[PDB]
């Protein structure tokens, strides 16, 4: 029987073609690619996982690669453009193993042992890193950004990212960081230069009064319960039997409303905050009239799960009843001001809060929505870079050095290995030359010369001198500040090798409903 083998070859070829399709977007000198959807949108993109996602293809192999890229972004987050190339290169290399009479189970075991050796290869290659050491984290995140399109303002997008990781969590010990602590907003219009940060948060709705639009040292109040006319949770109707009852209904409605407003005013409140609701909502015009008569702001119709963010930031805590509402529970921010976007909306930035907030927000502006989308994805992946960096503390410099080092040392292992596995190990060794070849190629270089130069450099055993896109050849990397964590490489390699072991095992596809 041969048809299974033909199917296997077809799947490997399909995976290789899909991988080759995105061979101009890797590393510091990658290039963007349009993806125009059938819908009325468009996406400029550089991150590999995104690109892989927008293709709504029907072939299983590319879908496997997409899910692999998803997993890597969940683990590491940056530049998943590489992992697909590695997977396809390993598939092409194992084509040669298959034609040379190597059983697929045997091939999978060879991958397992190669993984075993490569783990240590990377491990001894790396060196530990210092937390709170500004330069190492800065270079890591900046080189992470260099694989995206917003690199022209990296001097501005680096300090914001670093300040994020100082002000979100403590540097003492966490082993991981909650990303939902970090908050971002995207806005159409403005400029990359207008992008900035505030240690507080920003609220979207604008105050229902123009009399007071910027209050300082306000005692801010947040309320979440109903403010409307007295109405039970359960059905009812107030029956009026004469004019006098109508008069009393009017007067007592006014009295109840003003009684509530006087309670909140007596609590020493300065700015009111009302959540969002349906089915007898929580705001009245008379409330606004009262508040204007007493010079009080209000913001209405706010989200449910955002309560934690606001409460932690300001200190004001939610109450569903007036009786539990207390003056001590006022969050005191230095300044609540409304800003303009030059005819592009009005926001509310809360600043100088006296309560310890553990969440931060950052704003982004730009001439269109796609530039800010790309910048958002880049910043998100940089935050992933730093989350892995603090997860465990080990680094590895770029410049093509890691893959060529692993390639040559697996060549040596093959020289020190016998049996059927020796040539498989040789194939592994030859596999890790694709990435440096691509890096030299898209750098507008003659790939043979530079790649062989780096191969010889790693034959000498000396390092920290690798691919340089500024020098134009193989030169020092520490001065290039080109560094990536050991964790991203380890995760990439492990995920890729597990995926390809699954691939080698898999050889049969059948169509179902």
């Amino acid at each position: 029987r041969d048809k299974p083998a033909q199917i296997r070859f077809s799947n490997i070829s399909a995976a290789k073609a899909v991988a080759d399709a995105i061979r101009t977007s890797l590393g510091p000198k990658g290039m963007d690619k349009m993806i125009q959807d059938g819908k009325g949108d468009v996406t400029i993109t550089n991150d590999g996982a995104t690109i892989l996602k927008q293709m709504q293809v029907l072939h299983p192999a590319a879908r496997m690669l997409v899910e692999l890229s998803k997993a890597q972004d969940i683990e590491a987050g940056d530049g998943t453009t590489s992992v697909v190339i590695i997977a396809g290169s390993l598939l092409d290399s194992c084509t040669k193993l298959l034609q040379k009479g190597i059983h697929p189970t045997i091939i999978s075991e060879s991958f397992q042992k190669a993984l075993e050796k490569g783990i240590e290869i990377l491990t001894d290659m790396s060196r530990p890193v210092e937390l709170s050491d500004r330069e190492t984290l800065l270079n890591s995140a900046t080189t992470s950004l260099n694989s995206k399109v917003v690199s022209q303002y990296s001097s501005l997008l680096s300090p914001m990212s670093v300040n994020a990781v100082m002000k979100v969590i403590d540097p003492a010990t966490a082993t991981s960081v909650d990303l939902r602590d970090i908050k971002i907003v995207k806005k159409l219009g403005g400029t990359i230069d207008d992008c900035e940060l505030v240690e507080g948060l920003v609220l979207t709705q604008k105050v229902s009064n123009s009399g007071i639009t910027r209050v300082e040292k306000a005692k801010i109040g947040l309320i979440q319960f109903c403010l409307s006319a007295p109405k039970t949770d359960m059905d009812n109707q107030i029956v009026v039997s004469d004019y006098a009852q109508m008069d009393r209904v009017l007067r007592e409605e006014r009295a109840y409303i003003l009684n509530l407003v006087k309670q909140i005013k007596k609590t020493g409140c300065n700015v009111l905050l009302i959540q969002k609701s349906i089915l007898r909502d929580a705001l009245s015009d008379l409330a606004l009239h009262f508040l204007n008569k007493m010079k009080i702001m209000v913001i209405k119709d706010i989200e449910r799960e955002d309560i934690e963010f606001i409460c932690k930031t300001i200190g004001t805590k939610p109450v569903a009843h007036i009786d539990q509402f207390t003056a001590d529970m006022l969050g005191s921010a230095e300044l609540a001001e409304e800003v303009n976007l030059n005819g592009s909306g009005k926001l509310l930035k809360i600043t100088g809060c006296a309560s310890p907030g553990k969440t931060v927000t950052i704003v982004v502006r730009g001439s269109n929505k796609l530039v800010i989308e790309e910048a958002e994805r880049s910043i998100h992946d940089a935050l992933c870079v730093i989350r892995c960096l603090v997860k465990k503390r080990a680094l590895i410099a770029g410049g093509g050095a890691p893959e060529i080092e692993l390639a040559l040392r697996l060549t040596e292992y093959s020289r020190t290995l016998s049996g059927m596995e020796s040539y498989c190990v040789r194939a592994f060794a030859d596999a890790m030359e694709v990435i440096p070849s691509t890096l030299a190629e898209n750098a507008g270089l003659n790939p043979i010369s530079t790649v062989t130069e780096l191969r010889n450099r790693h034959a000498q055993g000396e390092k920290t001198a690798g691919i340089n896109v500024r020098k134009g050849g193989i030169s020092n990397i520490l001065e290039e500040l080109v560094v990536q964590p050991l964790l991203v490489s380890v995760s990439a390699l492990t995920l890729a090798t597990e995926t390809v072991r699954s691939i080698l095992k898999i050889d049969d596809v059948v169509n179902t409903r």
Binding site: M55, Q237, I238, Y243, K293
Partner: protein
């Protein structure tokens, strides 16, 4: 094997050129519409709506564009309008020619990174040089530099011939609403001067009102149409037949109360009316409807009452006359009373007829002044043209007055920057020096477009201006030549101050920033996948 993309992928320079093609196709289409010699473009909507337009953003907005980069340039023009409002046509042309130069350059096989970094650095250096090496004073002018700014605004517009009256009108209108924001600097309530229009007799028949004119008329001829003294009562409360509450039902077993409830439906309204009418009310302004009951009562009182009054205009007029916004008569507590200490202050209010129709007009809101312009024109389209023209002019002048800085134009800034940057660009001497050279060259289009729209010998005048600026720069002994630009009135190199042609520096800065931004954005785009449509 074949890519699983299932779509259509074009590679090479083709799509690049296609972007170029897009950047070509629209650009010259709008080319004929800016500068003192820009001629009008006529647009016919598919429903037979023929339109007159000359500012670029209004021109483009109703075009249907399916090519992506062309859409991007479309919203680029729209933003250029929405923040700046001037150079409404120039920016798309500048970006288009920049893309032309860039794509040709990459067709000569240069790394995109070098040229993109060149774009960024050149934008920065250009904005810098604009900041330093063209500083002049606007305090030498005032109340007249605004006139010249309005003249430069109308240059391509429909009223560029009758600017003497209109510019004075608009500058006085600006002075009429001049507010202060931070208590040390001025502030202007944009879109708070209503410019209500009419198919009048001529452009010379429009008049400016030192007061306010609604889109509103007197409710009935029973009321007096000219109140001697104006104490204004603004309202937001709906004055219709009062409804108590949506969640009340009546249950009556004693019919005696029944009829009296019918009385109540009026009484409350009626009662407040008396309260409303107790203070010697002159004019009543309400958003809610006014019915026969209130109509008869107000006729009996002789006080104007107008329903369906809008909101933002009501706020404007209440602030202008010193009036206050009212939604109910309740005071700090349940006491619902009317106070005579906040009634709006004005001279008189009249239902003046302009051409064949009447409207409410306010005279001289007290303690201050207010601005509103009645645009009377031969028809509706050209009157809308003045509408847009004056809006753009007010945007320009508010930019000028917010930052009192301005430089002469008509290519003066263009030629000076080109001369600097071409004689500059030795700070790198590398693959980016040629980039800076192409920046200095690419600004040649503005004199080119102005000359073609004016049928001037472009090469002679551009050579003269370039030579004067070059000798001024490299030889600062006679730096007077840096104060010279090109005017299309007679194709002259002149000190662009007698004509008054003057434009805010921030305008050029901002347009250049977005232009270079979009240029870089496109120059880091190399491949396209056309996914299959749904």
């Amino acid at each position: 094997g074949p890519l699983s993309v299932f779509g259509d992928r074009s590679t090479g320079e083709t799509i690049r050129s296609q972007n170029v093609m897009a950047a070509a196709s629209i650009a010259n289409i709008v080319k004929s519409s800016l500068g003192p010699v820009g001629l009008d473009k006529m647009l016919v909507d598919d429903i037979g709506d023929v339109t007159i337009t000359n500012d670029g953003a209004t021109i483009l907005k109703l075009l249907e564009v399916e090519h992506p980069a062309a859409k991007v340039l479309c919203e680029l023009a729209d933003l250029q309008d929405k923040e700046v409002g001037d150079g409404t046509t120039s920016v798309v042309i500048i970006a288009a020619e920049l893309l032309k130069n860039a794509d040709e350059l990459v067709k000569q096989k240069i790394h995109p990174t070098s040229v993109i970094s060149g774009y960024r650095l050149a934008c920065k250096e250009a904005v810098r040089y604009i900041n330093e090496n063209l500083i002049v004073n606007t305090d030498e002018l005032g109340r007249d530099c605004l006139i010249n700014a309005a003249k430069t605004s109308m240059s391509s517009k429909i009223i560029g011939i009758n600017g003497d009256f209109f510019a004075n009108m608009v500058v006085d209108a600006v002075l009429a609403i001049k507010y202060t924001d931070i208590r040390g600097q001025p502030r202007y309530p944009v879109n708070s001067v209503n410019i209500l229009k009419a198919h009048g007799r001529s452009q010379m028949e429009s008049m400016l009102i030192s007061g306010y004119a609604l889109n509103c008329v007197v409710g009935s001829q029973g009321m007096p149409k000219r109140i001697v003294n104006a104490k204004i009562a603004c309202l937001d409360f709906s004055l219709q037949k009062t409804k108590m509450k949506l969640g009340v039902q009546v249950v009556i077993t004693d019919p005696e109360k029944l009829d009296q409830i019918r009385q109540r439906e009026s009484d409350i309204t009626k009662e407040r009316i008396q309260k409303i009418l107790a203070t010697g009310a002159n004019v009543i302004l309400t958003t809610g409807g006014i019915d026969d009951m209130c109509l008869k009562y107000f006729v009996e009182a002789g006080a104007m009452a107008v329903r369906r009054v809008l909101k933002r205009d009501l706020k404007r007029i209440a602030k202008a006359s010193g009036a206050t916004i009212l939604s109910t008569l309740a005071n700090l507590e349940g006491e619902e009373t009317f106070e005579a200490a906040m009634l709006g202050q004005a001279e008189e209010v009249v239902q003046e007829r302009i051409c064949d129709d009447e409207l409410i007009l306010i005279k001289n809101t007290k303690a201050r002044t207010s601005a509103s312009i009645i645009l009377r024109g031969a028809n509706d389209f050209m009157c809308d043209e003045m509408e847009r023209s004056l809006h753009d002019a007010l945007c320009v002048v508010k930019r000028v007055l917010e930052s009192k800085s301005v430089v002469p134009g008509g290519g003066a800034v263009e030629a000076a920057l080109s001369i600097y940057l071409e004689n500059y660009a030795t700070s790198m001497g590398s693959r980016e020096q040629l980039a800076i050279a192409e920046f200095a060259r690419s600004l040649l289009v503005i004199p080119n477009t102005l000359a073609v729209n004016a049928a001037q010998d472009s090469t002679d005048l551009v050579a003269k201006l370039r030579a004067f600026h070059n000798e001024a720069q490299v030889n600062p002994e006679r730096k007077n030549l840096k104060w010279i630009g090109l005017d299309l009135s007679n194709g002259k190199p002149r000190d662009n101050k007698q004509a008054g042609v003057f434009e805010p520096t921030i305008v050029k800065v901002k347009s250049l920033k977005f232009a270079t931004e979009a240029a870089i954005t496109i120059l880091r785009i190399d491949d396209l996948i056309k996914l299959h449509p749904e």
